[PDB]
Design a protein around this motif. Sequence first.
Motif, PDB file in Angstrom:
ATOM      1  N   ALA A  39      43.689 -69.759 -46.906  1.00  0.00           N
ATOM      2  CA  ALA A  39      44.857 -69.516 -46.026  1.00  0.00           C
ATOM      3  C   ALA A  39      45.885 -70.642 -46.172  1.00  0.00           C
ATOM      4  O   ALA A  39      46.691 -70.823 -45.239  1.00  0.00           O
ATOM      5  N   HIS A  40      45.856 -71.370 -47.291  1.00  0.00           N
ATOM      6  CA  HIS A  40      46.870 -72.430 -47.539  1.00  0.00           C
ATOM      7  C   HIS A  40      47.399 -72.307 -48.971  1.00  0.00           C
ATOM      8  O   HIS A  40      46.595 -72.457 -49.910  1.00  0.00           O
ATOM      9  N   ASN A  41      48.698 -72.037 -49.126  1.00  0.00           N
ATOM     10  CA  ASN A  41      49.309 -71.920 -50.477  1.00  0.00           C
ATOM     11  C   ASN A  41      50.109 -73.192 -50.774  1.00  0.00           C
ATOM     12  O   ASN A  41      50.572 -73.340 -51.920  1.00  0.00           O
ATOM     13  N   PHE A  42      50.245 -74.079 -49.784  1.00  0.00           N
ATOM     14  CA  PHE A  42      51.009 -75.340 -49.973  1.00  0.00           C
ATOM     15  C   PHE A  42      50.171 -76.518 -49.465  1.00  0.00           C
ATOM     16  O   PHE A  42      49.325 -76.310 -48.576  1.00  0.00           O
ATOM     17  N   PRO A  43      50.363 -77.759 -49.972  1.00  0.00           N
ATOM     18  CA  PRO A  43      49.511 -78.891 -49.579  1.00  0.00           C
ATOM     19  C   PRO A  43      49.609 -79.231 -48.084  1.00  0.00           C
ATOM     20  O   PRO A  43      48.589 -79.215 -47.424  1.00  0.00           O
ATOM     21  N   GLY A 100      55.848 -66.593 -48.075  1.00  0.00           N
ATOM     22  CA  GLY A 100      54.386 -66.406 -48.087  1.00  0.00           C
ATOM     23  C   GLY A 100      53.662 -67.617 -47.530  1.00  0.00           C
ATOM     24  O   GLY A 100      54.337 -68.621 -47.231  1.00  0.00           O
ATOM     25  N   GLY A 101      52.336 -67.529 -47.399  1.00  0.00           N
ATOM     26  CA  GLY A 101      51.540 -68.654 -46.873  1.00  0.00           C
ATOM     27  C   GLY A 101      51.298 -68.520 -45.381  1.00  0.00           C
ATOM     28  O   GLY A 101      51.612 -67.449 -44.827  1.00  0.00           O
ATOM     29  N   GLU A 102      50.763 -69.569 -44.750  1.00  0.00           N
ATOM     30  CA  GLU A 102      50.449 -69.524 -43.298  1.00  0.00           C
ATOM     31  C   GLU A 102      51.754 -69.507 -42.495  1.00  0.00           C
ATOM     32  O   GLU A 102      51.699 -69.194 -41.291  1.00  0.00           O
ATOM     33  N   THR A 103      52.881 -69.818 -43.143  1.00  0.00           N
ATOM     34  CA  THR A 103      54.197 -69.845 -42.451  1.00  0.00           C
ATOM     35  C   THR A 103      54.573 -68.423 -42.021  1.00  0.00           C
ATOM     36  O   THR A 103      55.592 -68.273 -41.320  1.00  0.00           O
TER      37      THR A 103
HETATM   38 CL   LIG Z   1      50.599 -72.667 -46.525  1.00  0.00          CL
END
Ligand SMILES: [Cl-]
Lengths: 55, 148, 144, 44, 188, 449, 34, 240, 99
Positions: free
Chosen positions: A47-51, F328-331
């Motif tokens: 559930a994390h695509n960014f650091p 996209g992402g948790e955002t």
């Molecule tokens: Cl994220």
Amino acid sequence: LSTMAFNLNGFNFNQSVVDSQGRVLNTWADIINRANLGMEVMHERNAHNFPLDLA
Amino acid sequence: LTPVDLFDDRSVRDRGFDLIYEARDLDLPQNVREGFTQARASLDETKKRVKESEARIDADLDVFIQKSYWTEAREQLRRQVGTLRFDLNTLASTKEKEAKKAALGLRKEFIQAVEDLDFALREKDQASAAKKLEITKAKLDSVLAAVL
Amino acid sequence: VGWLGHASFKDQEGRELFVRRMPTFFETFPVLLLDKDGIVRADVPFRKAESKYSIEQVGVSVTFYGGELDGLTFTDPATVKKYARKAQLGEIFEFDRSTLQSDGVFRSSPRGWFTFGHVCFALLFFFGHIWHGARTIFRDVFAG
Amino acid sequence: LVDERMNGDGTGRPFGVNDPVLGWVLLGVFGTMWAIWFIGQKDL
Amino acid sequence: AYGDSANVFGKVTNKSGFVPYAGDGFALLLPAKWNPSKENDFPGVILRYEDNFDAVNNLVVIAQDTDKKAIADFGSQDKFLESVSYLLGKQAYSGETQSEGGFAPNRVSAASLLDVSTTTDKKGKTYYKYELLVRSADGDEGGRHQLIGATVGSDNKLYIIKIQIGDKRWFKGAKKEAMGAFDSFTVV
Amino acid sequence: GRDQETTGFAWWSGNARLINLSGKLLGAHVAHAGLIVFWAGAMNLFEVSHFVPEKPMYEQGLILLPHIATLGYGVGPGGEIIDTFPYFVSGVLHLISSAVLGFGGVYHSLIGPETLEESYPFFGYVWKDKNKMTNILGYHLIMLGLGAWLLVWKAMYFGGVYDTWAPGGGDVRVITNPTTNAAVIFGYLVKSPFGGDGWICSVDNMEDIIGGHIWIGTLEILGGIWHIYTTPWPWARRAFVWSGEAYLSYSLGAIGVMGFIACCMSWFNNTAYPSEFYGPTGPEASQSQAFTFLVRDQRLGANVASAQGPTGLGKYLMRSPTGEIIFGGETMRFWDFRGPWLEPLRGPNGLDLNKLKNDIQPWQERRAAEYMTHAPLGSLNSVGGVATEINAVNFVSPRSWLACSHFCLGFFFFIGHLWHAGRARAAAAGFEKGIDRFDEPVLSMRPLD
Amino acid sequence: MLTLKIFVYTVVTFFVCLFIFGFLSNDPARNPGK
Amino acid sequence: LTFDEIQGLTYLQVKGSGIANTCPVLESGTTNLKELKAGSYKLENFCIEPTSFTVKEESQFKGGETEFVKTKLMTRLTYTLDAMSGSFKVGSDGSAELKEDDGIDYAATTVQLPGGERVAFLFTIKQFDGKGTLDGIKGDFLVPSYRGSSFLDPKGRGGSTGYDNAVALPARADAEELLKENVKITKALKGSAVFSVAKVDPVTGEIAGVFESIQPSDTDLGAKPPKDIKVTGLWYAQLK
Amino acid sequence: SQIFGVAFSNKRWLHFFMLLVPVTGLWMSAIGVVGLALNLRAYDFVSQEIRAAEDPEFETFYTKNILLNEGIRAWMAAQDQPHERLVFPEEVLPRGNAL
Ligand SMILES: [Cl-]
Ligand code: CLA
Ligand code: CLA
Ligand SMILES: CC(C)=CCC/C(C)=C/CC/C(C)=C/CC/C(C)=C/CC/C(C)=C/CC/C(C)=C/CC/C(C)=C/CC/C(C)=C/CC/C(C)=C/CC1=CC(=O)C(C)=C(C)C1=O
Ligand SMILES: CCCCCCCCCCCCCCCC(=O)OC[C@H](COP(=O)(O)OC[C@@H](O)CO)OC(=O)CCCCCCCCCCCCCCC
Ligand SMILES: CC1=C(/C=C/C(C)=C/C=C/C(C)=C/C=C/C=C(C)/C=C/C=C(C)/C=C/C2=C(C)CCCC2(C)C)C(C)(C)CCC1
Ligand SMILES: CC1=C(/C=C/C(C)=C/C=C/C(C)=C/C=C/C=C(C)/C=C/C=C(C)/C=C/C2=C(C)CCCC2(C)C)C(C)(C)CCC1
Ligand SMILES: [Cl-]
């Protein structure tokens, strides 16, 4: 808990103790941080695509 | 087992790849991180950007107003035209005494016009937007004549 | 059922690699192969996007001496990693988990169970001593 | 589309009234209750 | 029990943030917070340091005996980079996949050269330098910055310094440390 | 002074001995106002002295200066601080004003008469005297209405408030067409407090803000005249406790709710609280990070449009449950976020990858990059960082401070409402002190079980 | 599913009305004595 | 809502409406396709709104033929491919080629079939190369793995990043569980799609018609067999 | 009796209950710590562990907590237990997507 809900985390004394030349003298706080890192890198494995976990 | 592929992306740095990193360098002054100082330093670059904004305000926008594309028109304002106000200010700053004062006055009269046109787009009034845009074009041209 | 035999893990360089044994405090321990010096030379990387100690890139082969796999050599990454995971649990023995339908989880020995039960009884009996002893000392007050 | 939905989520509709019935029922219920309260105990 | 008086109302020993280090024919200013490491990631590793917390932020000084008396002898910087590509690492994953955004089919890792240079020390020897950002399908650390500099010492030995910083820390100050140590690296 | 033997209230309840002392009560309230004005002036001058032009106000842990900046003082295009002397003027004015209020309070607490009813009938007031109480409320209601209109005046005259959504760049703008449509002005009031609707925190246009203050300003002044020339109706008298503690409990409950609303405003709103001065909002910081990487990767050579993530729900872009294209992402949780730096790239249907592919302005990037780094995440010792971070950055979002402080203030004041309200109701009944020991109601009640 | 919404909306209003009008019913006089 | 009608509405007016998950309708133009000039045209603003998602399933009978069954979508909207750019051409004859290039060509979709079974599938036409007539432009499209190699399962085992073994059961860490552990197969599959141009607006250079595609469902990284998903809907594009 | 439905009627019993609850709880936790001393712990339920392994999709908060524990042990053992002298290459450490 409500304040921490606004991103006001508790005391952070990570790398607070430093020697003469600048080498970091680890403390019990640093050890607690080591564990916190483990839980963080695991929570929401996909559930994390960014650091940064700004969310 | 495969070697990690390598790509020559040195050109990305040329196309403002370090903009994000520079903006995130807290050591740099806020103006430097925002690029305000850089623009104030590069007069020709600022003047160019101003002409780019002029084109967008003049040879553009009217299209959306004609087809009632308010969202795009209102987004047409700001965006690249977003720095127009800062740009006009530094160009007027290049002037002195009355010259700078007179230039700043033209800048204000134009800024007011752009806000009137924007409110017309907000009320989605094509007729008002059309006439308001023409007024904005004249205002900008006057300010451009002084700043340039 | 029997002993597969000693597993010898060696890298392509020919260096003998030792699989770090799992510490008792650890329910799951990462597989790591270290040289005699004690420097990690190979391991099973959790991230394989750009590994630097992958069993494959290190080219580690497991050769079993004695036991069932005596003289058996394995170079298949999967096969080597499988034995490496067993090696970290100590000597590799064959087990029939069908007759009893084992669940695949370790159990405590009667030694550990006896210690746990008697320690528990001992701690509780401490309260018993305090309770009955208090009643004897304060018999007059507890009288009724 | 593939299914049918109220499509009211995210929309700032007063008291979540996406249908006139909803608005009417709320006022009607309150009015009846007010009448009962006033009749049982006069307000002023 | 040396009777050293406490530094009460005294002066700080070192606030430079860099501690000068000297090795075999190579010298550089290691980041003060960084601690010694004991993992030989590549062959010929001479010095290996890592950040107190994030191990991604690490520095390795590899020295290999090379007949060539000049880094230029190795060939164009691009050619040399190809020969030193081993540092970037190798993709052990071999599964065929096309569900990784921003990555070519069956590729879960991509390294992007963003800068190349050939600085020269006062002594005169040149230094093949390369700056690359390696990205992964997992996107951990938002990418890993790679500063690689190489040169041949008077001992006819190729010295290579590779500094890796997690993008997260890179734009959070870690870049200043990496750059300082990378520029400090000098081979005699 | 006073002693418990003559009041029945201990030192820890001394201020409760001033309930029937109108004159002393006046001094106490007037003095407390002096303290409030004092801090406003003192802290403002302290911030001005500790202010540096090389850093944004949010990085300098300044809370008061952002307020003056939003009013459109010493600010320029992009929110750049031109001068700070206006801020110095505010501190000096408040500090000297606090002296006057302080003297009045001290006087009305020492020399001034303990009561006023005996001498000054107009000021003289007795709890329960609804007529007088309503009149006092009226006077203060008119005052608040005038204050709101002063803000409205500053918006359409005497300069203008800073507009972060200003056309062709964010800067101070003189509101000329304030929203007066009741449907729009009162729409926020009937908006759900849940996500998307964001109740009144959703206000994103200064026109509505100034127009809303126009409405509240008039209503308050009219309401004051009404309460000045009207007395509570029978229904009200039969459904309210008429006592000083009861009146305080009502105010405590109301101010407590207002505190919670202010916390949410500072944490979610970016219009009334310019991100340029107050820093980015939680949702803003998250969206900024997604934008920062999306831009960087796209430049490297990644198709953010067809970039499937590990879950397969889009690495950079995806669709909101409603259908709007979102980062996209948790955002995805902050998909309802709206900022002046992201709006231009958006369109009728969520984001416009066309703008994302080309037309992305450098400032849109620089601003997002700065916000991402200065996220609201922080520690009590002010060690800036998401968490599990080393002690290197010294920054805590001013939004975090205001949100946390006002929330806690609201919670305590709500508890104060429960304490004062319950005690007021019990006092009226007569059982505040305790049971009669001879008329215990339970003893006369049914034996139940 | 609008019927479900209409029902819930009515049910809620009814109970809320009872609470408001109920306290309006000279609740302060519910005191055991005075 | 025609393209211009959608453009007139602001993001806030569209937000919460759900119209963002709907392709524009070519109300104008002619049902005839002959007018469509013969040549190559940028397939800009290509949108595919799935009208229905049917999953092939054996009939009640154990040997009952596998027919497509009706299903109920569980994922609130978020299933309309849009903002897709590609290359479309038309010859003097019916010859028509439709080639998708980039854009939101993929869209994960979880639908529940009768019996409380949720079947997840990545609705997509990635790399579609239709080459039929103006109508029935038959073609094949890529069907990337619903989950990526990085994706970790509850046990933590995954492709590029994962344990690869049942760390939970140490004695049974490696065994027949191989199908689920150390597999995490992320190989992409293929699907067939057919597009037909219902109407063409030559003045506005806009084309719209119906689409029909049968694609494999999620294979749980090889853990489960894929299931045929027949998705039928309407498509809109601007030839500019 | 009316607010909660039940209520103490004996002051003695009330206070005896006030002292029994806390003492009982502490002694219970003490027995649990005795088990941990011997490593006899209720770490996980094999039934769900087997199901999760055989059925990859199956997932519960219990399985999620297991993964967290795995990270805590791997990302603190190196320092928390220096005697073990464990040097874990960063690649061997368990890290989730991104982060
Ligand atoms: Cl994220
Ligand atoms: C905002 C804080 C505040 C304020 C404004 C007041 C105000 C007041 N209190 Mg009070 N009190 C407070 C907090 C406060 N209190 C707290 C926290 C407690 C708990 C310890 C008490 C406990 C308490 C008790 C028990 C009593 C009062 C009483 C009073 C009243 C008269 C005081 C008196 O009789 O002798 C006056 C006190 C002095 C003369 C000593 C010094 C006070 C001076 C006026 C302060 C001035 C300081 C400032 C620097 C001067 C500025 C001068 C200017 C030129 C700059 C008065 C209106 C009395 C009362 O009226 O009861 C009916 C009383 O008995 N208070
Ligand atoms: C403007 C708001 C307001 C006002 C005018 C009053 C007024 C009064 N309160 Mg009260 N109260 C309030 C808010 C208010 N309260 C809130 C929000 C709470 C919830 C915490 C309470 C809880 C409360 C209790 C429990 C009691 C009172 C009592 C009283 C009466 C006794 C006064 C007194 O104690 O003498 C002199 C003043 C003092 C002794 C106060 C001493 C100074 C305090 C204790 C130090 C606190 C410093 C604080 C930590 C600083 C941070 C504050 C904030 C940033 C969090 C008095 C008439 C007492 C009473 O009997 O009611 C009739 C009583 O029992 N109040
Ligand atoms: C579908 C479904 C059903 C789903 C639900 C699933 C679910 C949530 C399952 C969980 C079930 C569950 C409850 C699990 C917990 C298990 C567990 C932790 C057990 C612990 C057992 C145990 C013996 C623990 C040791 C410690 C211990 C002894 C604790 C006791 C705690 C305890 C009972 C304290 C009191 C609690 C309580 C509410 C007290 C009320 C007291 C009371 C009536 C006051 C009234 C009163 C007070 C006065 O002062 C006076 C003067 C008078 C006159 C008077 O009258
Ligand atoms: C709105 C109401 C909320 C309802 C909540 C439920 C009420 C619980 C009442 C059950 C009490 C049981 C003991 C009866 C026996 C009984 O009547 O007690 C007897 C005692 C009365 O005192 P006596 O004078 O009888 O004392 C004599 C004693 O020494 C024994 O004779 O009352 C209490 O102990 C009150 C404490 C009850 C504690 C309440 C339990 C709280 C949690 C219970 C477990 C929760 C499990 C949840 C799982 C889903
Ligand atoms: C009654 C009483 C009380 C108290 C009260 C009070 C609170 C009072 C206060 C009052 C006050 C409220 C005071 C204040 C004062 C202040 C002042 C008097 C100020 C001054 C100023 C000046 C002198 C100047 C300054 C400056 C400027 C502004 C500019 C710059 C510089 C400077 C800073 C220098 C108590 C509690 C004890 C209790 C008992 C009774
Ligand atoms: C400025 C501005 C605006 C406006 C706002 C407003 C308009 C506000 C108002 C608000 C309000 C409107 C307030 C009021 C409140 C009141 C209330 C909420 C009521 C309450 C009631 C009570 C408290 C009572 C109760 C009870 C019952 C009934 C029963 C018996 C008992 C008693 C009596 C107690 C806007 C939006 C544009 C935004 C921007 C700014
Ligand atoms: Cl988790």
